[PDB]
Nucleic acid binder design. Structure first.
Ligand SMILES: Nc1nc2c(ncn2[C@@H]2O[C@H](COP(=O)(O)OP(=O)(O)NP(=O)(O)O)[C@@H](O)[C@H]2O)c(=O)[nH]1
Ligand code: MET
Ligand SMILES: [Mg+2]
Ligand SMILES: [Mg+2]
Lengths: 129, 414
RNA sequence: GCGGGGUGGAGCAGCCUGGUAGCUCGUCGGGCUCAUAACCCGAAGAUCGUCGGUUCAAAUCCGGCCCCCGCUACCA
């Protein structure tokens, strides 16, 4: 068992010294088209069932996700207003308390929905909605 | 999403000064074990710390980078959520010599050990012997040896010290303790280190049958400066459970606990209470199972508990019974050399009226001997120790030039 | 809880009751003595941490701020 050091050193000698996608909300007719929703919330492990949970209540308009991952909204809205609206998801569930890394995920449970942070792991008392 | 499971295993992180110990526990957990201001301001380990993490393995990816301790697999490039195994924690010891006795406490708690060696100090450093024999007196022969800080030392010098330490393995209880090269800062090869903890250090078979005992290591008054009288929480006593388990609203006693004045002489008072909280890090569990330090707050006043007053005491069920003897007998076999010593002289056998230091589990005492026999002694103590089992692992030292270096291994026959 | 010290080579006075930056060990010069120490006299030395308000007018009333800080501990 002398090889238990050699290769481990050889690959020890190979380790020596994400951002928000620019959501472009456009409108044609009475709809809302986006560009990179297959890699906007899937950059932070956000389901298509859970990302359209609070937005349906905050816009009061029906809608669903597509097969590619894009999100279609029924209604006319500007670009930088969707974020100012969905702040109650962008700050209430996908942030942390001491790291501010944005690399966080939500949990689904039987009594509350927690904030699993891949920087620290800090949660808060909140009830899913 | 990943379950919330308390740790089921402890691992002793021991080694000499500047070895990369606290930075190793940072390499595994992401958090450090320097928690009192002096520890930072002096930059050396004075006391034992705590740190926690999980383990998940990506069933698809190759070994070992996928062995990451968070609900993610992205370091191996996979989208899958890894298989969870456990939640793993450590006992971060000091390297200093006036501070050695402390880690002996933790030696009675760990279910494993990762021992570090300095590639960038002359080997074998004196105190390394003392750590090795600490593990050998307590008897946790399960050891993972590591050479550290390899980024300044070349691969040939690393090989030479690897041969030195492969040799350090042969001829003792540790013939096959392995060496997996990592560096504690740059986060190199730590995946293979986690794999090593897993494979070679498994959690023992648990005994949920014996009277649940809690071995105190620390305690605090969480009542912050400015705490008004409406929200007063009890004083937390933290340790690790080894045999049995603890539950919410369990009726216990702290033993020995306080000193009080009794009958014209000195004695101690058994400290009775009801269990009000049991914590594992940042997760709230209603039961405490063995494996990992378990903090229990109760209906006790934290003035009796703040600032590590009761250091090392035991706590048992308020329907239990433990022998409390002011003067205890010991079967002690003497070390062949003084292990942490720069120059290893002989052991000068223990003569009557001498002063000796004991660490029982986590509790510590000074004592003077009253009846000196070759293998058996009866020593008068300044405080009675609680001996929950037969012939418990005490660790014994005599004072050398102001540094209490060990002299043998002892057994209290109750 | 946030607050204090901000000033000759120095040590602190010195506020509220605003117009001498105040006394002492020190520093150079002169007296007294046969000469030295002690004792008497004269000058030199910060010009108040700094912007700003009050104020005819400010260490002196205080605020903004730059520095030194300062009574204080892991909060399972
Ligand atoms: N480059 C490098 N520096 C390290 C590593 N581990 C620790 N250091 C740094 O080197 C110095 C000494 O290491 P230290 O962290 O004290 O290791 P230690 O064994 O825990 N020392 P002690 O237990 O006495 O407190 C510190 O400045 C520390 O940040 C490592 O793996 N690589
Ligand atoms: C450092 S005490 C170990 C466990 C404890 N619950 C913490 O927090
Ligand atoms: Mg250390
Ligand atoms: Mg004279």
């Amino acid at each position: 068992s002398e090889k238990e050091y050699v290769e481990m050193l050889d690959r020890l000698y190979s380790k020596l010294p994400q951002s928000l996608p620019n959501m472009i909300i456009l409108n044609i007719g009475n709809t809302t088209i986006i560009r990179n929703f297959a890699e906007y919330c899937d950059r932070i492990r956000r389901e298509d069932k859970i990302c359209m949970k609070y937005l349906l209540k905050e816009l009061a308009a029906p809608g669903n996700v597509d097969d590619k991952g894009e999100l279609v909204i029924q209604g006319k809205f500007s670009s930088q207003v969707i974020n100012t609206l969905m702040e109650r998801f962008l700050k209430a569930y996908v942030e942390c308390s001491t790291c501010k890394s944005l690399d966080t995920i939500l949990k689904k449970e039987k009594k509350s929905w927690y904030i699993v942070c891949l920087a620290c792991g800090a949660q808060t008392p909140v009830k899913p909605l | 999403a990943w379950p919330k499971v308390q740790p089921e295993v402890n691992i002793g992180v021991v080694g000499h000064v500047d070895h990369g110990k606290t930075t190793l526990v940072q390499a595994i957990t992401g958090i450090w074990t320097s928690k009192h201001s002096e520890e930072l301001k002096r930059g050396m380990t004075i006391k034992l710390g705590y740190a926690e993490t999980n383990i998940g393995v990506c069933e698809s990816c190759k070994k070992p980078e996928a062995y990451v301790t968070e609900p993610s697999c992205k370091s191996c490039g996979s989208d899958d959520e890894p298989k969870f195994l456990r939640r793993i924690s450590f006992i971060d010891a000091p390297g200093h010599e006036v501070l050695m006795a402390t880690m002996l406490s933790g030696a009675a708690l760990m279910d494993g050990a990762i021992l570090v060696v300095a590639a960038n100090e002359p080997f074998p450093q004196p105190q390394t012997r003392e750590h090795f024999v600490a593990l050998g007196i307590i008897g946790v022969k399960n050891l993972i040896i590591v050479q550290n800080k390899v980024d300044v030392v070349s691969k040939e010098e690393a090989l030479s010290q690897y041969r030195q330490i492969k040799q350090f393995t042969k001829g003792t209880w540790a013939e096959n303790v392995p060496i997996i090269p990592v560096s504690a800062l740059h986060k190199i090869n730590i995946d293979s280190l986690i794999e090593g903890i897993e494979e070679y250090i498994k959690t023992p078979y648990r005994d949920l049958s014996q009277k649940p005992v809690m071995l105190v290591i620390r305690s605090f008054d969480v009542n912050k400066p400015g705490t008004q009288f409406n929200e007063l929480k009890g004083g937390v006593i933290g340790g690790s459970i080894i045999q049995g388990l603890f539950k919410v609203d369990q009726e216990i006693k702290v033993l020995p606990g306080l000193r009080v004045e009794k009958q014209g002489k000195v004695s101690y008072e058994p400290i009775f209470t009801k269990i009000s909280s049991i914590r594992f890090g940042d997760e709230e569990f209603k039961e405490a199972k063995p494996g990992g330090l378990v903090a229990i707050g109760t209906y006790l006043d934290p003035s009796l508990t703040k600032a590590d007053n009761l250091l090392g005491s035991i706590i048992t069920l308020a329907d239990a019974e433990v022998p409390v003897l002011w003067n205890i007998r010991i079967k002690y076999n003497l070390l062949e050399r003084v292990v942490g010593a720069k120059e290893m002289l002989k052991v000068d056998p223990i003569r009557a009226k001498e002063t000796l230091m004991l660490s029982v589990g986590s509790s510590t005492t000074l004592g003077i001997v009253t009846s000196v026999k070759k293998d058996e002694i009866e020593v008068e103590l300044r405080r009675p120790v609680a001996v929950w089992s037969n012939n418990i692992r005490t660790v014994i030292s005599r004072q050398i030039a102001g540094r209490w270096r060990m002299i043998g291994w002892g057994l209290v026959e109750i």
